[PDB]
Amino acid sequence: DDEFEEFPAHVWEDNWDDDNVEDDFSNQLRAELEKH
Amino acid sequence: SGLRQYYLSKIEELQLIVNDKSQNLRRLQAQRNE
Amino acid sequence: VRRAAVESLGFILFRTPEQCPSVVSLLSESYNPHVRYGAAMALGICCAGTGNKEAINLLEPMTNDPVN
Amino acid sequence: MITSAAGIISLLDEDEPQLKEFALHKLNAVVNDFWAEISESVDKIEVLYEDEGFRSRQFAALVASKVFYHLGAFEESLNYALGAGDLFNVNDNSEYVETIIAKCIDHYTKQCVENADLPEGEKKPIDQRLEGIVNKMFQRCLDDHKYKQAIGIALETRRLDVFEKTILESNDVPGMLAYSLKLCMSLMQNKQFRNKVLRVLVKIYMNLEKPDFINVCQCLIFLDDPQAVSDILEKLVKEDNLLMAYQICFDLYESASQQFLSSVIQNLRTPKDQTLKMIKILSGEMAIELHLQF
Amino acid sequence: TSGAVLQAATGMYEQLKGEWNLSKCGEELGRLKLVLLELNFLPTTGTKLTKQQLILARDILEIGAQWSILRKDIPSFERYMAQLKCYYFDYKEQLPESAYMHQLLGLNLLFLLSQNRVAEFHTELERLPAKDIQTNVYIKHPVSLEQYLMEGSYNKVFLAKGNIPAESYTFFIDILLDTIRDEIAGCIEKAYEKILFTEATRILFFNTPKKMTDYAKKRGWVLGPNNYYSFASQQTTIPSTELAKQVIEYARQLEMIV
Amino acid sequence: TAAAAAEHSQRELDTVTLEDIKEHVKQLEKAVSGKEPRFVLRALRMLPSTSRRLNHYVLYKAVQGFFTSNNATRDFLLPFLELPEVEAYLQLLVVIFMMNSKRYKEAQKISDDLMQKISTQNRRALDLVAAKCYYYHARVYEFLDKLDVVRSFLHARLRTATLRHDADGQATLLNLLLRNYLHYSLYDQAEKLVSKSVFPEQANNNEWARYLYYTGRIKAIQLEYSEARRTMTNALRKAPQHTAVGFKQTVHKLLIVVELLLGEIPDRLQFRQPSLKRSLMPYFLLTQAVRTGNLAKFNQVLDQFGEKFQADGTYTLIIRLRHNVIKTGVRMISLSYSRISLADIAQKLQLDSPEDAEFIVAKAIRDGVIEASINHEKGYVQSKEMIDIYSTREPQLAFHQRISFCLDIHNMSVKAMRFPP
Amino acid sequence: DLYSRYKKLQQELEFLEVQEEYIKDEQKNLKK
Amino acid sequence: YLASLIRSVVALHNLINNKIANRDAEKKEGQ
């Protein structure tokens, strides 16, 4: 088919939230219960 | 000369009209024949 | 009336004999035998004494029809 | 290049009739690229035209016609092109000029065709400058040794005068006459216009140095003028010409209707041996006898 | 002839420069415009003047724009910068750089803010060189003003009004403040349901509270000052005819032979 | 002689390519002789492959053995190589090979020869070849780095090709003219022209994609984010799949930017795409920074990748970014809440003051990105009372648009149904 | 030549138009 | 809407068949 030579040129399905950096849920829960 | 170009333009326009008209007409003929 | 209309169409168009077959060919393969007869007679009147080619070509299959 | 006309439109918007003309000059110079933004400012050009003008009533018309052309509203473009007047300069090779001339011809033909059938009094007036442009086109065609197709333009415009002028003043008068007769009998449909064109054709044939009496008689058959054909035959017999008269009568019988033949025979009735055998031929006795013998 | 007219051009341009570097300034500008018209504004691809007198024409146009801003004439203002922008952006190679250009461009940008042609504004921002947008102050300050305005920090832009790169940015602050009041209005119309009078006052910065009735005396959404002003409460039937037209259109488009 | 064997194989390939050129030419004769002013598109469909496979000796032998009908125009081809449509198509191949050789001066001379010839010949079945020639001439002047007279000349050609009711030529000329305006940053003039022109509704898919891309660029820089985004998504959909990597990359970049401006988040699948991962990685960093709402990360990524930002062109849009970064923050705050208070909004968005948060939410109302009310009497932003949207005319309108589209597809299909006899 | 061709082609166009509307009407009747 | 979608898909399939048949016929006639 026609081509646009005019314009110069994991194995999963990742998700946006995955890259977010946060503490491990175990540590989060430990903190929550310590302050609760 | 100028009117020669005038007529050439008119021929071209009506010739394209006639061509597409004939194509559509033959399609309609095939449909009616079916 | 349908047959007479087709014959009258031929009467209208005789002056340009090559032109009528383009019309009456589509009728020639009609389900109404009266319309077929009208197409035959219209072509005949239109191209009378002309020896046109497509007119004869159209007439032939009609010359082989089940109706009388 | 320039890359922007906003400054020029600003020059136009002023109220100085000495700056305005230069602004219009530059606009006409650059319209080949900047109609895009000149379009929404056209209304300024429209109002600037619709005034005393001061050479604006001549240049703003051309500018407005150019911009409306580049847009595509030919209906509005043509009016301002006409208002421009002599600035049109029909004789020049330009695509805008070509297309505006084409649209002018189309509009004139449409108006003539639609108004010809209307009453002799209630005819919508034509634009004088439109007529002038069309006449200039006629003259260009005649000057360019393009005598053919001038009759075609005249027939489309429904003007018999120019058709007669071009068919007369041209080479191969018999050829042009034959071509015009072919067009009139074959293609064009309007019966009244056909009658007028054939009247003109017979007039030309007669005024010719050696009239084509055969074509004249065929045209007379088409017009159904038994009195005229009878006068023609009487004149032909009065002068020492008999072969032409005999052939004319034979063709008259072979083509015209029985009522027409009877009418021409009565007109003839109203040496005398020539008249008698002409009447007999018109009745067709010799024709039928010859066919039977053949 | 030509050289003499160029010399006269320089002569009365220097006359105007000595004059101011009001009304008589206007007539002088008109005379300069006429003279430039016997001369040429734009070479327009086919004359190629390459004139230091064309640089001088750009200069006199700049002084004309300055006179227009002094007079507060928005029409002539716009006309002069239209021509000036043509001169600037078009013949960059042929002409030398004018240091007194970014100031005027920034002034045009601020005027565009004040008149609320943000789309145009962004067009000129794209046209401008990218580096100058940050490096310069004359150009950047309008950019920062638009940034604050389109962020919504109306108080912050009010504060920033004090910062002006040059006195040329005059009366554009005022008209831009009026525009800001208009946007705060917008907020009042189609948000802030059931707003209070004092809150409207201290959000929409009117003049003195006695003049607080402004924008209601004029824009006036039947404010109905029922103590609270009620915000005038400003903010179920089958469309059978329209939908029947649509359905009949479907039937028509099905039944047509094509 | 491995070189000799390779030369013989290359000459066999040359014979095959010459036979292919003969096939295309005879298709052109069939098209001109018969109705259906087409099959020139069939001949051109292999134009990219033929141009890629062209060779110096191939073209030299072609010019030597052809153009025998008449004219001595082969004198303009033989020294540099050392009919109504056939001459145009062979000559187009010649100029394409000259471009491949990169000799721009005689490339443009020969292209001007083409252009005069086509302007002289006012035919109707030559329009497609003329459009291809126009595209390649715009490209040769781009390579020459002039792109100055193209504006005016292609503008005149577009005027002629729209005065003649043509579609392919109109689309190609409009695309090239818009590309010139963009390359020279004449966005205002481009906007005026697109507003005052009409794109041929029935135009080649590639030209449609180009026109949508350019129009989306105009709208994005013109402050029409919704229109820019929808047009750009449509352009990406229309674009080819297994090619046009550069065009797809540019569309993806600008679409990602315009989405971020609208206040949404691009799909991670775009970035994950192998053909676009490396190219779009800077925009992946930008998307991460905006989603995090970290101004420091935004600034550092901007400083790091300013180079690509001139390479593509987004700065005005990239500051409008910061604007819509705070806009996206407020949009999500209103999306995942129904009755949040102004103090809570300020706390969650790190805004300095509740009054500032109030101004920001009002501007969110401007942009229509929260579609929520607010009450300052008690100081909380109520949301639109969500309605079960099935007892209303929204489903009717959606189904109406889709039904009309389906009917139009059926009509177009049953009209394109053709019979050659 | 030019005018004659123009008129012939105009006649062809109009005639094909009438033949098209005929085919439409007759197709309607055949469906019935 | 579902009905119209099915009808359009069928029409497109018919057009594809017609295109294939036309090209096959023209190729055979040429050769």
B4 interface with D at CB cutoff 8 Å: yes
Q: How far apart are CA D163 and CA D147, in angstroms?
A: 10
Nearest to E33 among D4, D6, D19 (CB): D19
- Which residues of chain D lie closer than 8 angstroms to G9, CB-CB? none
Residue type, F217: R
Q: How far apart are CA E245 and CA E249, in angstroms?
A: 6
Residues of G with CB under 8 A from a CB of D: 1-4, 6-8, 11
Residue indicated by tokens 């010839």: F117
Helices (H), F245-378: 245-262, 268-272, 274-292, 295-304, 306-312, 315-335, 342-349, 354-367
Closest CA to F185 of A6, E138, E43, D3: D3
Residue E213's SS3 state is coil
Domain total of chain A = 1
User: Solving technique for this entry?
Assistant: cryo-EM
Burial F21-36 (b: 16+ CB within 10 A, else e): beebbebbebbbeeee
Phi/psi at B33 (5° precision)? -65, -40
Domain extent, residue F398, equals 383-417
Q: How far apart are CA E113 and CA E178, in angstroms?
A: 11
The angle, 0 to 180 degrees and rounded to 10, between the axes of the packed helices F245-262 and F274-292 is 10
Taking a contact as any Cβ pair under 8 Å apart, which residues of chain F between 199 and 258 contact chain E? 221-223
Residue D82's SS3 state is helix
Dihedral sign for Cα F35, F36, F41, F46, please.
negative
- Which residues of chain E lie closer than 8 angstroms to F308, CB-CB? none
Q: Are residues F242 and F335 in the same domain?
A: yes
Query: What are the residues whose beta carbons fall under 8 Å from the beta carbon of D238, sequence distance 6 or more?
Result: none
Please state, in angstroms and as integers, the Cα–Cα distance from residue D140 to each residue in B2, D91, D240, E149, following that order.
8, 8, 44, 65
What distance in Å separates residue F204's CA from the closest CA in chain B? 18
Residues of D with CB under 8 A from a CB of G: 148-149, 151-153, 155, 182-183, 187-188
- Which residues of chain B lie closer than 8 angstroms to G21, CB-CB? none
Q: Are residues F329 and F256 in the same domain?
A: yes
Beta bridge partners of F341: F380
Resolution of this structure in Å: 3.4
- The residue of F397, F410, F419 whose CB has the most chain H CBs within 10 angstroms, and thus the best one to mutate to test that interface, is F410
G7 interface with E at CB cutoff 8 Å: no
Closest CA to F89 of F21, F157, F171: F21
Residue F125's SS3 state is coil
- Search chain B and give the residue with CA nearest G21: B25
- The residue of E86, E93, E123, E127 whose CB has the most chain D CBs within 10 angstroms, and thus the best one to mutate to test that interface, is E86
Q: How far apart are CA F406 and CA F151, in angstroms?
A: 40
Write down the domain spans for chain E: 4-253
Taking a contact as any Cβ pair under 8 Å apart, which residues of chain D between 3 and 62 contact chain F? 3-4, 32-37, 39-40
Q: How far apart are CA F79 and CA F82, in angstroms?
A: 5
E232 touches E226 (CB < 8 A)? no
Helices (H), chain D: 6-13, 19-38, 42-49, 56-71, 74-84, 95-116, 128-143, 150-157, 160-168, 173-186, 191-207, 213-223, 226-238, 243-255, 258-269, 272-283, 285-293
F397 interface with H at CB cutoff 8 Å: no
Beta bridge partners of F375: F380
